[PDB]
Each structure stands twice: as structure tokens, then as C-alpha cells.
Amino acid sequence: GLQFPVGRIARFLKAGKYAERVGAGAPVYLAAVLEYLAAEVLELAGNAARDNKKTRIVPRHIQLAVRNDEELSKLLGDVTI
Amino acid sequence: GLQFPVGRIARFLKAGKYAERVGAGAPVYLAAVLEYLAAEVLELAGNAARDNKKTRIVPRHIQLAVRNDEELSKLLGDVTI
Amino acid sequence: NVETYKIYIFKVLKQVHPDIGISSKAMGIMNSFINDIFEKLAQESSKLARYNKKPTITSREIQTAVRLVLPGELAKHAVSEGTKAVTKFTS
Amino acid sequence: VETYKIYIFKVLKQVHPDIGISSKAMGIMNSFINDIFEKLAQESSKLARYNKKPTITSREIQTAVRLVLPGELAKHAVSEGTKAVTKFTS
Amino acid sequence: EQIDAELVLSIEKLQEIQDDLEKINEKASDEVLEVEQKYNVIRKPVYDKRNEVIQSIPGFWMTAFLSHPALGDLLTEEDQKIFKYLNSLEVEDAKDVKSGYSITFHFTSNPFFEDAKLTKTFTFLEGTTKITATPIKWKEFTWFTHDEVADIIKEDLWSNPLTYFN
Amino acid sequence: SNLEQIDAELVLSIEKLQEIQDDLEKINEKASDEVLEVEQKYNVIRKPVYDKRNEVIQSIPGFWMTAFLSHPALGDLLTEEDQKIFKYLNSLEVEDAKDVKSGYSITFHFTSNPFFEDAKLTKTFTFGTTKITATPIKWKEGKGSFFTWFTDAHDEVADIIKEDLWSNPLTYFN
């Protein structure tokens, strides 16, 4: 039930000259991972809407959503609007 | 020790679009044949050159060397000059 | 290089937080992140697949094997079938 | 059209080493050999399509070596076997 | 006279070699055109899934055409209205890619012309070419029976129309 | 209403078009890559033929000279001094970069003469961006055109050597 584009990713990997050959399971596994991370910054940067009593998620809402969660700071680093 | 060009003839069959595949028997076999069919029409055309009293073969010498022998007029034809 | 994952960001937003939107530069910062992780992962995975020298059997290999081992139309059918199973598992 | 003139000349120098040949005369011998090759090729090419049996050429022996042998052994294995076949195939 | 003869042998050997280069450049530039054809197949369903996704973007073909540095200035105001109905543009190399190609122009409800196209087809194989173009059915464009316009539609805009649209 | 439906699908559709175009670029990369693979395969078939031609032309004295001259466009770029030097012009060579895209050299090989030192006047073109490199015309001790062409500087001289003369010089020669 993956929202992320398994096919489009298989091309990004091959046409990017990362490796010359790509197992069918690799873009599927990469697809779910990119989505899981999306679901995490979105869960949180959409909770920064309710804390800030707003609904249109703006450059701002994300930034405070990352620095609050420990791990997501070390991953994506500092965020600037 | 063949005189005629095996490789060049091999290529002529491929590029000719006669067949996309060739076992190196054929270019060898075929080269040997075009050599013998020259080594007849020369051992005759060259005799012709000493009949008409010369040592420089010309269209008149080949025409006579062919038409007189039966097999080579059937193979080649009239030889209009 | 930068790719668009934006369609598939939206589609995820509308699960965790159905009733919440996102501004133009706010989406162009979510995209900026997925592109940053894709590199980190593919570039790393490229070092991992180049460390390893052990040969892999993928579908390309099975599919060629079908042609060499199966005869003629059995083979053309077999390939249709195999190619259709893998394509469905990717979709 | 095609050139066998180097070899028509070269054969002439074994049957009658004593005689040259003109341009219109060579050009007519060169036309003779073209004419025969064409008739022979067009025949072998029908007779190939008639007798459509599977056939093992060096083509296939080559690829079989590439498939069956390990990486380094195959490289030499091929080279040796290509020599073997190019030997007087020219 | 050991190298009077051997000087012709050398010039015909040289003729052999230009003979066989013409064969090897024909295989080569034939394998080149097997690759062109392979990709036209691969591109078609994507070009087709583009044409369809473009139908849900309102002024795309007109906005794109105009935005172009070259193609924009030629369209006058009368053409431009008709062009507001220009729902699609369709380039396609014919199946034997080397021969030719055609630049269809799709349209919808508009009184000035009932024609549902303005194609401008081509065929060439390179000294001699040709051009057969749809006759304009003006109901109740100085193009239609070297050429620069067809090139810039095939190679530039059709290729990527979105670059211009922005 | 339905009015909300279409404004969204206008957002959706416009990126699905930026995908299609993003992903058509990667498809043309992959295609025009296999064309350079074709061009590579063939430079490799032709190197042995372009060689055994060198060999054959060594048994025709002043072949390239007369060929160069017999070309309409390469023919009338010289003058008298060039032509005397050209007596000693016993080879030509136009080989591409091992990856075809990078470039090609154009080396005028030579023989003994009291008119300069070097046994080859190379001129390579390296690309990805465009840049000319040449051999210095080491005029001999008594100081002394076509040899202006060997600057280290959109070049009609090479687009005739690589695309006509070197391709098939024997046609011009006759």
C-alpha cells in the first residue's frame, strides 16, 4: 500500500549510475523507507499546527517539529526558513 | 595456400544480408571456388593472348576463350564488349 | 539533480493529518529532505554493492535461463508470465 | 559491385606468368567473379533457410566458454581459440 | 618494374579498405538507428501519458508555444484565439524512424475552422525530401503545402514544453 | 464543490508533468548512452582497418600530399613554402578519445628535412567543455599559413579532415 513511486525510484538508482544492476526488492525497500521518514516529519510538522493553533503547514511548523524530536535533528541537520 | 580473400568474402556474405550467420567453412569453401573459376578463364584467356600473337590479355581474348569452351558460355553468357 | 517526491508527500500527509495542508516553500523543504536521504542511502548502498564481489541471481538471469532452456513458444509464454509476476510485485 | 582484381591479377601470374591484362579486360574478369559470387550467395541463402536445423558455430563455442569457464581462464581460452580459427582465415 | 605493378596492387588494396569501411560504417550507423527505434517505442506510452495529463492543465499548449523565444512572435491575435482551443500538439517519428515524421495540431469547438487538425507530415531517404500538409477548412498558418519551424517543434518544444510554459 | 476537485487535480497534474519531464531526461541519457556504446564498439573495429590503411599508404609515395591538394576546401589553404614541407608529409592520423565523447587528435606525421625538428604536429580537442591544444612548430635554425592552425586556442579545418579526407582520402586523390 506504498504511496511512494517504487518504479520512479528504480530509475533514479540505475540512471544515477549508483550501481549497474538493481534487484527488484531494492527500490521497493528504499520506497517504504523514504515514505516512513515522510510519515515522521509529517506526523510531527502537522502536530506543530495544533501547538501553533494553525493549519497551513509553513516553512516554520516543520523546523520546530524537527528540533523537538532528538533523532530527526542529527539526521536532517539544522533547518532555516 | 588460397589466393582469394576468405575474410573479405565472409564479410560480403554477412553485409550482403545473404545470411546473418556463416560458419568459416563457407568463406574458405567459396573463396577456393572463385579462385578455380578465375584459374580457368585465365589459363584460356592467356592462351588466346598467344593465338592473336600478344602478351597483354584484352576483351577480345576473354570473349574468344569463353565462347569456344561450352561450360563457360553457359555460366557467363555472351560477354558483349 | 533534484527529483520531485511531492505528489507522494501530499498522499502521506492526507493519512497522518487528513485535514491539514502545506505552503509552497514548506513542501519544497520536505522534498529537499527526501532528496538529501535518497543520496545518503543510494551512495552508501553503492559502496556496499561494490565491496561485495559475490554474484547475484536477479530476474534478468532467470529470464535468459528461460530462453536457453525452454523451447520456442513455451519460452515466449514463460517470459510473458514471469515478467508479469515481477511487474505486479513492483507496482 | 566489388574488387577481386588483386587476386585475378595474382592468379594470372601462376597460369601464364608471362601475360598482363588491360583495364577493360580486368574490369570484365572482376565482373565475372562478382557475377558468380552473387549467383552462389543467393543460392546458399535459400539453401540456408530450407535446412533450418540448429547449428553450433564458433559464435556459440565462444559464448559457451564465456558462460562455463571462470573469469580469467575464459579470457585466454577465447584468445587461444580465436587464433586457431583466424589461422589462414584471411 | 617490380614497383610499377606493386603500385597499382597498393592503390586497389587501398580501394578494398575504403570498400569495407563503407560496410562497417553501414553496420555501425544501422546499429545506431536500431537504438533510435527501440527508444521511440519506450517514449511513446510516456508521451501518451503526458498528452493525457496535459488535458487537466488549462492553457498549456498555447502558453507553452507563445512563451518560446522563437515561436511566440509569429502568432498574431486572430491565430491566438483559435489557439485558445489548441488542446494538444502531437509530434511522432513514423515507425521506420529514418523515413519521416508528422506534427499534428489538435483542436475543439471553434466556428472559424471545422478542421480537427493541421498536420504537416514529412518523408526523406536525404538529398530529396517532401511536405504534404492538411488543407485549412476556414468555417462559415503560412506553413502548409531547410525548414526551421518543424525542427524547433520536433527537437525543442515537443521534447520539453514545460520549460517554456514557466 | 467539483470546483475544489479540479484546483487540486491542477496541482497534481502539473507535478505529474514535472515527473514525466524529469523522467524523460533520464530516458534520453540512457538512450544516447547506448549510441556512444555503439560508436565505441566501432572505433575499436575500425582502428585495425585505419591502421592497415596507414601500412598500405606507406607503399604510395606522397599519397596524402596529393589527396590534401585534390580536396576543393583543404586544397587552397596552402601557398609555396607549405607545399615544399608537404614533400615530407608521409602520414596522417585522426583517432578519437577512447570514450568517443571526450575528443580526437589530428597528427600530421613527418620525415627528415632541413625545415623543422618534430616527427609529428599533433592537435587535440578535449571536452564537459571545449578546449584546443597543439604541437609547437619548432622551425629549424634558419628561421621561417596552415601552420597558424597549431595555436592552443567553430573550426572548419578539422570538420573536413575527420568527416571527409581521413574518412576516405582515395576519392579525392582520383
UniProtKB/Swiss-Prot annotation, chains A, B:
Gene, per the UniProt record: RAT5
Give GO cellular component annotations, separated by semicolons.
nucleolus; nucleosome; plastid
Q: Which GO terms describe its molecular function?
A: DNA binding; protein heterodimerization activity; structural constituent of chromatin
Q: What else is known?
A: RAT5 is required for Agrobacterium-mediated transformation of root but not of germ-lime tissues.
- What does the PTM comment of the record read? Not ubiquitinated.
Q: Which family does it belong to?
A: Belongs to the histone H2A family.
Localization in the cell: Nucleus; Chromosome
Q: What's the protein name?
A: Histone H2A.6
The UniProt keyword set, sorted, is: Chromosome, DNA-binding, Nucleosome core, Nucleus
Give the organism, scientific name.
Arabidopsis thaliana
Q: Name one GO biological process term.
A: response to wounding
Q: What does this protein do?
A: Core component of nucleosome. Nucleosomes wrap and compact DNA into chromatin, limiting DNA accessibility to the cellular machineries which require DNA as a template. Histones thereby play a central role in transcription regulation, DNA repair, DNA replication and chromosomal stability. DNA accessibility is regulated via a complex set of post-translational modifications of histones, also called histone code, and nucleosome remodeling. Required for the T-DNA integration step of plant transformation by Agrobacterium. May play an important role in illegitimate recombination.
UniProtKB/Swiss-Prot annotation, chain D:
Query: Can you summarize the PTM annotation of this record?
Result: Can be acetylated to form H2BK6ac, H2BK33ac and H2BK34ac. Mono-, di- or trimethylated at the N-terminus to form H2BA1me1/2/3. H2BA1me2 may be acetylated to form H2BA1me2K6ac.
Q: Which domain of life is it from?
A: Eukaryota
The alphabetized UniProt keywords are:
Acetylation, Chromosome, DNA-binding, Isopeptide bond, Methylation, Nucleosome core, Nucleus, Ubl conjugation
GO terms for MF: DNA binding; protein heterodimerization activity; structural constituent of chromatin
The protein's location, in the record's own words, is:
Nucleus; Chromosome
GO CC entries: chloroplast; extracellular region; nucleosome; nucleus
Which residues lie in coiled coils? none
Site of the Glycyl lysine isopeptide (Lys-Gly) (interchain with G-Cter in ubiquitin) crosslink? K87
Chief location: nucleus
Q: How does it assemble?
A: The nucleosome is a histone octamer containing two molecules each of H2A, H2B, H3 and H4 assembled in one H3-H4 heterotetramer and two H2A-H2B heterodimers. The octamer wraps approximately 147 bp of DNA. Interacts with AHL27.
Annotated family = Belongs to the histone H2B family.
User: Could you tell me what this protein does?
Assistant: Core component of nucleosome. Nucleosomes wrap and compact DNA into chromatin, limiting DNA accessibility to the cellular machineries which require DNA as a template. Histones thereby play a central role in transcription regulation, DNA repair, DNA replication and chromosomal stability. DNA accessibility is regulated via a complex set of post-translational modifications of histones, also called histone code, and nucleosome remodeling.
| Name of this chain's protein | Histone H2B.1
Q: Which organism is it from?
A: Arabidopsis thaliana (Mouse-ear cress)
Curated annotation (Swiss-Prot), chain F:
Sorted alphabetically, the keyword list is:
Chaperone, Coiled coil, Cytoplasm, Nucleus
An example Gene Ontology biological process: somatic cell DNA recombination
* Highest taxon of the lineage: Eukaryota
Main location group: cytoplasm
Q: Disrupted gene: resulting phenotype? A: No visible phenotype.
| Coiled-coil region list | 6-47
Q: Could you tell me where this protein is found in the cell?
A: Cytoplasm; Nucleus
Q: Spell out the GO cellular component terms annotated for this protein, sorted alphabetically and separated by semicolons.
A: cytoplasm; nucleus
Q: In which tissues is it expressed?
A: Ubiquitous.
Q: Name one GO molecular function term.
A: histone binding
Keyword hit for Magnesium = no
Cite the domain annotation text: The acidic domain is probably involved in the interaction with histones.
Which family does this protein fall into? Belongs to the nucleosome assembly protein (NAP) family.
Q: What does this protein do?
A: Acts as a histone H2A/H2B chaperone in nucleosome assembly, playing a critical role for the correct expression of genes involved in root proliferation and patterning. Required with NRP2 for the maintenance of cell proliferation and differentiation in postembryonic root growth. Involved in both intramolecular and intermolecular somatic homologous recombination.
This protein's assembly is summarised as:
Can form homomeric and heteromeric protein complexes with NRP2. Binds histones H2A and H2B and associates with chromatin in vivo.
Further facts: Double mutant nrp1-nrp2 shows arrest of cell cycle progression at G2/M and disordered cellular organization occurred in root tips resulting in a short-root phenotype. Double mutant nrp1-nrp2 also displays hypersensitive response to DNA damage and impaired somatic homologous recombination.
Q: What is this protein called?
A: NAP1-related protein 1
Whose protein is this, by species? Arabidopsis thaliana
Name the gene. NRP1
Coverage span on the entire protein: 19 to 224 of 256
